[PDB]
Amino acid sequence: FTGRKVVTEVDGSFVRAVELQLQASSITIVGGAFALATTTGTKQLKVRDDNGTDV
Amino acid sequence: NRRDLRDPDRTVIASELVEHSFGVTLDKHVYAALKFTDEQRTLDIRDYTKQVLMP
Amino acid sequence: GLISDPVEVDPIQVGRDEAGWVQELRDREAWPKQEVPEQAKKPAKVGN
């Protein structure tokens, strides 16, 4: 049995934690130019920003 | 899986474990083949070990 | 048939090709870089 809680201030503000995120300036589709296997073939695409993350 | 505590329903989601597999195969025959006429075997070759086997 | 006859196709080789686990790779000396062959990205069989 588990339970969790986020401790907030008396006015509902959350100040015990701070969240940080990397800036993304540009994105590029992985693999560059690509071709499908057949006429009906399908493939799952993937795109990465300049930080290398999978967005 | 997770379910709410004190839920009126008691159904439990079964989790089945799956084992995967893949094949490893021999597929190449790497060789080196030499041929010598009697003229080359008698006259040209002066030391078989240092002229044929080592290369 | 005959000993002097050309070698017949190996049933072991036929079955191995049918299983499709032989390894094919991109050419080293092809520009631009070749696409991944469909065999190299197949998923693992679900049953051992």
CA B29 remoteness from chain centre: 12
- Which pair of structure tokens corresponds to residue C40? 């190299």
Q: Are A47 and A28 in contact (CB under 8 A)?
A: yes
Helix or strand run (H / E) with residue C11: helix C11-19
Q: Are B40 and C36 in contact (CB under 8 A)?
A: no
Q: Is C21 exposed, middle or buried (0-12, 13-18, 19+ CB in 10 A)?
A: middle
| Min Cα separation C2/chain A (Å) | 43
Residue from C26, C31, C35, C38 to probe the interface with A (highest A Cβ count within 10 Å): C35
Closest CA to A25 of A53, A2, A4, A6: A53
Contact across the interface for C44 and B21, Cβ inside 8 Å: yes
Contact across the interface for B23 and C47, Cβ inside 8 Å: no
Minimal Cα distance from B20: which residue of C?
C46
SS3 readout for chain B: CCCCCCCCCCCCCCCCCCCCECCCCCCCCCCCCCCCCHHHHHHHCCCHHHHHHCC
**Resolution (Å units):** 3.4
Q: What method was applied to determine this entry?
A: cryo-EM
How far apart are the two ends of chain C, measured CA to CA in Å?
38
CA distance C36 to A31: 10
